[PDB]
C-alpha cells in the first residue's frame, strides 16, 4: 500500500475534549440550518458512574 499516515494520539483524556458525532432518527441532514447544538453534562464529576 502506497498511502499511509503517522499516528499521533493527541488530546488529553477528558469528557468534552472528546469530539462528538451526531446521528438523527428521522433522516440525514443534507443542510445544517441554524441548528443550535448544545451539550450538557452532569454536575457531579467525582463518582465514576
Amino acid at each position: 500500500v502506497l498511502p499511509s499516515a503517522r499516528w499521533q494520539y493527541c488530546g488529553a483524556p477528558d469528557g468534552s475534549q472528546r469530539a462528538v458525532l451526531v446521528q438523527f432518527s428521522n433522516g440525514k441532514l443534507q443542510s445544517p440550518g441554524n441548528m443550535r447544538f448544545t451539550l450538557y453534562e452532569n454536575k457531579d464529576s467525582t463518582n465514576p458512574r
Binding site: V20, L29, P32, M35, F37, T38, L39
Partner: protein, 51 residues
C-alpha cells in the same frame, strides 16, 4: 463552544485484531488408523482326533 456542523468525512479506518495463521496451513494431523486384525503368532493344532 458553538458546536457547528463540520464537513463530511473522507473515509473510514477500522481497527480489529487479526488471527495468527503460522500454525494452521500446516500438513494435517489426522487420528492414526487402527490396525487391521492380524493372526496371532504361535497358533498350533491343539485338538488331535481321538484314536
Amino acid at each position: 463552544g458553538g458546536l457547528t456542523c463540520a464537513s463530511a468525512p473522507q473515509g473510514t479506518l477500522r481497527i480489529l485484531e487479526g488471527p495468527q495463521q503460522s500454525l494452521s496451513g500446516s500438513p494435517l494431523q489426522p487420528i492414526p488408523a487402527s490396525p487391521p486384525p492380524q493372526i496371532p503368532p504361535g497358533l498350533r493344532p491343539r485338538f488331535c482326533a481321538f484314536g
